[PDB]
């Protein structure tokens, strides 16, 4: 073996150079862009190697913490474009802090609860800010944020009776859901609805009638899932689709074989990170949307009695993903990002960290196997693959709400 | 009338025609979180938007105000919803609104609200005449814009405009054969017109795809389409394909070709093929080659496939 102060990396092996793009001497916009990213990434990788000396990689926890702590209270006008997504900012930041095991002061927690209460609509659901119409995306974010806080104060903010009525007000006869009244339809809505309904215990027999079938129609020839039937497979929509089906216990409605082959193919042989769709670029946020699909598929196949499943690893290159996130997605000033050259933002900070946690932790049944690349302190808290909040938070919230009746239903 | 960046722009709090209504500030609570330090202009427009919304004022001034609110944050879906309420209530010229959304999407093509607004207008007018050309212009700037392709599929299916889409697909594939959004549109068009059961159509597609593969052997999209149009009937149902790929292996031993062979072997074993032991041995050898040398990023997947094959066909 090697001394504790040097840790060989997959991305630094001499044979890794063979993984560079082969454009077959036929250049198109796609290959040109891919080659540009690979050139930059190789430069980054090389900066972490000093011949046979390869220092352990470090997650800059403290820098990330200070960036997050500041954002939770105030934001520059650069975030005016997210004025209709305030609950998302709460969730992204709180989940990042949770992954980093950084305590949330009680005062700050109460202030977040009060703010989300102001975003809650009298018709049920939460809007992007005080007085805004409710929308399933901020509703999903608000519920997740309240569950991360996990106090009875936070749980009780949610008006469950109106929330269920609101979900009914968005339900379509073909099984799909509108994102908001008079709004668009895509797989994101099914997941947002399934996530908040299961956590708050408001699922009725008919709420999701036809939903599983509609989601299956979104799986396409590629194996992944598109936003609506007929559309290109995309990691974001595929995560939403599979996670929703897992909540509904209808994963078998999909061709899991083609889905598995599709997502594993989305990990970039050279960069180590994941792309959102075939022939597009690597991006740190897909560390969650794409890689998060492996724990879901593992669970789904394990429920089916698959005798070939691993008892120690997810079906993606866990080490290579950690290498991509740690070497290429950290902003030296704190925060994480899409790829070198891009600026940090709270959204990428949330998902790059969520993906890193998934890559470090394997769990199935009574089996637990951790693979924490770099210094030991890099280990993050685990995240639930369905909800993307701590597993402890999921259990605590589900248990709390299971003690309440389904609004006006028996 | 006057844009937010125009030299003569005046804050709403200073407009005489707006003096009769009090602005409604946003209440973020006494101890704010994720508080955005808005510019004076941003806050001014939204304080008045909140006022007209709270009063549910269906007026021409409210309608013009939404235009500025949208310029400040086109992702504010509440503003868009209210603007649509006003369009109906004021009986606004929808063709003029179409010219408006056209300009807005050109500026912010990756926004969900703008594409949905356009769809609603097209639905209200039952007029798709400008759609294919407009979308084509958006795709000329970003050939992979997801929202544009989604809107394009909706228009084509809702108004049955299939006649020239395969020709459009062919042109875009000529420009960039690696454009996965275009291969997806190819499947979309064929499955919804002739279908793939017509053996003449299937042969044409398999031939076309194989030609693209020979031209650009490492383009994953073509390989994925080839598998996509053959997978449901079963890859083992096409014996000649195996031979052709086997002949191209010695000169094009790419991970895509090797993986495709494993996929064929998997299906063959699932269908009581002849020489089962030999096929299983060949598949396991390729899984090892993929895991250790040719496609190591997917070592865990290939090892799983190897174990899976043994659990299903060892005997």
């Amino acid at each position: 073996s090697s001394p504790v102060w040097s840790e060989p990396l997959y991305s630094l092996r001499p044979e890794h150079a063979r993984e560079r793009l082969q454009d077959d001497s036929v250049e198109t916009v796609t290959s040109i862009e891919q080659a540009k990213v690979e050139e930059k990434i190789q430069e980054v990788f090389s900066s972490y190697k000093f011949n046979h000396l390869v220092p352990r990689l470090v997650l800059q926890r403290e820098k990330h913490f200070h960036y997050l702590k500041r954002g939770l209270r105030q934001l520059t006008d650069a975030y005016e474009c997210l004025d209709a997504s305030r609950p998302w900012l709460c969730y992204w930041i709180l989940h990042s802090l949770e992954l980093l095991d950084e305590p949330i002061p009680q005062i700050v927690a109460t202030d977040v609860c009060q703010f989300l209460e102001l975003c809650q609509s009298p018709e049920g659901g939460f809007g992007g800010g005080p007085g805004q119409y409710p929308h399933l995306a901020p509703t999903y974010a608000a519920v997740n944020a309240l569950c991360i806080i996990g106090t009875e104060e936070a749980y009780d903010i949610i008006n469950r009776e109106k929330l269920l009525q609101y979900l009914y007000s968005l339900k379509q006869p073909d099984g799909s859901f509108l994102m908001h009244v008079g709004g668009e339809v895509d797989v994101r809505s099914a997941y947002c609805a399934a996530s908040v309904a299961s956590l708050t215990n408001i699922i009725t027999p008919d709420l999701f009638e036809g939903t599983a079938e509609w989601i299956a129609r979104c799986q396409n020839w590629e194996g992944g899932i598109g936003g609506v039937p007929g559309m290109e497979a995309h990691g974001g929509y595929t995560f939403c689709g599979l996670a929703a089906l897992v909540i509904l216990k209808r994963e078998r409605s999909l061709n899991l074989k083609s889905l598995l082959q599709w997502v594993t193919s989305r990990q970039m042989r050279f960069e180590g990170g994941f792309q959102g769709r075939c022939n597009k670029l690597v991006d740190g946020c897909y560390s969650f949307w794409q890689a998060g699909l492996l724990p879901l598929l593992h669970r789904a196949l394990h429920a089916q009695g698959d005798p070939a499943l691993s008892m120690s690893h997810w079906m993606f290159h866990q080490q290579a993903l950690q290498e991509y996130i740690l070497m290429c997605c950290q902003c030296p000033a704190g925060g994480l990002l899409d790829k070198p050259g891009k600026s940090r933002d709270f959204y990428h900070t949330c998902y790059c960290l969520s993906g890193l946690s998934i890559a470090q932790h394997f769990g199935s049944g009574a089996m637990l196997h951790d693979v924490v690349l770099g210094v030991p302190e890099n280990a993050l808290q685990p995240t639930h693959p369905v909800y993307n909040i701590g597993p402890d938070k999921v259990i605590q919230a589900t248990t709390y709400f299971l003690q309440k009746p389904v609004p006006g239903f028996e | 009338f006057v844009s937010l960046d125009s030299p003569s722009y005046v804050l709403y709090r200073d407009r005489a025609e707006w003096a009769d209504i009090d602005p409604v500030p946003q209440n973020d609570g006494p101890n704010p979180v994720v508080q955005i330090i808005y510019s004076d202009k941003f806050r001014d427009v939204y304080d008045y938007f909140r006022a007209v919304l709270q009063r549910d004022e269906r007026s021409e001034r409210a309608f013009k105000l939404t235009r500025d609110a949208i310029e400040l944050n086109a992702a504010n879906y509440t503003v868009w919803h209210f603007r649509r309420v006003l369009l109906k209530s004021l009986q606004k010229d929808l063709h003029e609104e179409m010219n408006y959304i056209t300009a807005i999407i050109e500026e912010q093509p990756k926004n969900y609200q703008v594409w949905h607004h356009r769809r609603v207008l097209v639905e209200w007018l039952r007029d798709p005449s400008q759609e294919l050309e407009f979308i084509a212009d958006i795709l000329n700037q970003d050939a992979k814009n997801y929202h544009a392709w989604q809107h394009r599929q909706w228009v084509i299916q809702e108004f049955k405009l299939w006649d020239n889409e395969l020709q459009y697909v062919d042109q875009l594939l000529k420009e960039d054969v690696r454009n996965n959004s275009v291969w997806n549109q190819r499947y979309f068009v064929i499955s919804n017109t002739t279908g793939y059961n017509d053996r003449a159509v299937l042969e044409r597609e398999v031939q076309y795809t194989l030609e693209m593969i020979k031209l650009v052997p490492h383009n994953e999209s073509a390989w994925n389409y080839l598998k996509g149009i053959l997978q449901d009937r079963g890859l083992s149902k096409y014996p000649n394909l195996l031979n052709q790929l086997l002949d191209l292996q010695p000169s094009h031993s790419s991970p895509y070709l090797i993986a495709f062979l494993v996929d064929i072997y998997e299906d063959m074993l699932e269908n009581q093929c002849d020489n089962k032991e030999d096929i299983l041995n060949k598949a396991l050898e390729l899984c090892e080659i993929l895991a250790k040398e040719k496609d190591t990023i997917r070592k865990e997947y290939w090892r799983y496939i190897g174990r899976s094959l043994q659990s299903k066909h060892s005997t």
Binding site: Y79, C81, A84, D283, G335, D338, D345, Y347 | K110, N111
Partner: peptide
């Protein structure tokens, strides 16, 4: 932070 230019909007 440049969330305005990022193509990663989920809403």
């Amino acid at each position: 932070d440049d969330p305005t230019a990022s193509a990663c909007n989920i809403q």
